[PDB]
Amino acid sequence: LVHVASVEKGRSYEDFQKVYNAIALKLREDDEYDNYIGYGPVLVRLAWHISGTWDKHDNTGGSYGGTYRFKKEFNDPSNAGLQNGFKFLEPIHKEFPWISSGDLFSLGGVTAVQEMQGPKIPWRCGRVDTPEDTTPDNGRLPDADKDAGYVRTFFQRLNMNDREVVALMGAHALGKTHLKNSGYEGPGGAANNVFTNEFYLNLLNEDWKLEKNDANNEQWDSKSGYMMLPTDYSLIQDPKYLSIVKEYANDQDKFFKDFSKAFEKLLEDGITFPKDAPSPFIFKTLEEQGL
Ligand code: HEM
């Protein structure tokens, strides 16, 4: 499988900045979703789940084909709750019908991080919608009830090393787990719609307690009202992971710089860019535009 990126006909930077601004403006307007957390968190989980199906061995899955629009990927149990991010994006796609699906779900992920004050993420266009039969089967996204060894092994298939895995996991500071979507309940911190290095700090400074929740699943709870998944707490159990968790807890600027690189790579995995292709775009936030 070779997937060559092809720029949407005649489009350039200015066209994708209007799609970015349209997404950002609605993030600001529908601010009441999920008890005022808003849509930013579910939009970065959607961009990670449409890219997380990639397999490095035969180049199937990944964000290129925009196949989350088909029944099989959209009804995946692992994607429970992301229907809310899709529904948020469906009026922006009506307004900009020329944008491809893979491009709109990955650009919604980029827009949410930056609007929630994270790092700039360089983004490249050119994903092309592929047919229903190119949709990956269910079962390629990770389980939550597992340990460090499982996380390390799982992220090998997306070829992410340890440093890239721990940076990517810092997004678990955003939003929350929802019992009816995943069988886990609660937020991982105080500031869940602002992008910070809070996840690492909470992991190292809270007193965590192994409890059983209402869906019979075990999770790590703190007196402050925060929770960690078994797969999140794995990060301080493993020696390799623990020293990278400590580096990002002590340096937010290195964490932003490493999350930006690993998140762009996640979104671009499996796509070939021709050398006549445009350079990555860096979009201005509503704030830098005075909007
Ligand atoms: C071992 C890897 C991972 C596992 C097992 C995992 C699991 C989960 C689970 C169980 C939820 C709760 C969903 C719900 O109930 O609504 C969740 C939410 C979320 N995860 Fe992950 N995750 C993993 C990696 C990542 C990565 C790599 C990213 C992003 C780059 C990410 C971003 C998010 C975000 C932002 C949410 C919040 C969604 C919301 O508030 O609706 N996850 N994760």
Curated annotation (Swiss-Prot):
Binds 1 heme b (iron(II)-protoporphyrin IX) group per subunit. The record marks 45 as: Transition state stabilizer. Keywords: Heme, Hydrogen peroxide, Iron, Metal-binding, Mitochondrion, Organic radical, Oxidoreductase, Peroxidase, Phosphoprotein, Transit peptide. Forms a one-to-one complex with cytochrome c. Present with 6730 molecules/cell in log phase SD medium. GO terms for biological process: cellular response to oxidative stress; hydrogen peroxide catabolic process; response to reactive oxygen species. Belongs to the peroxidase family. Cytochrome c peroxidase subfamily. Its EC number is 1.11.1.5. GO terms for molecular function: cytochrome-c peroxidase activity; heme binding; metal ion binding; peroxidase activity. The active site is at residues 49, 188. Heme b binds at residue 172. CCP1 precursor is processed by the rhomboid protease PCP1, which cleaves the N-terminal hydrophobic transit peptide. The m-AAA protease (composed of YTA12/RCA1 and YTA10/AFG3) is required for CCP1 maturation: m-AAA protease promotes membrane dislocation of the CCP1 transmembrane segment within the transit peptide to ensure the correct positioning of CCP1 within the membrane bilayer, allowing intramembrane cleavage by PCP1. One of its GO terms (cellular component) is mitochondrial intermembrane space. It is found in: Mitochondrion matrix; Mitochondrion intermembrane space. The modification Phosphotyrosine is found at residue 150. It comes from the Eukaryota. This is Cytochrome c peroxidase, mitochondrial. Its cofactor is heme b. The gene is CCP1. It catalyses: 2 Fe(II)-[cytochrome c] + H2O2 + 2 H(+) = 2 Fe(III)-[cytochrome c] + 2 H2O. Destroys radicals which are normally produced within the cells and which are toxic to biological systems.
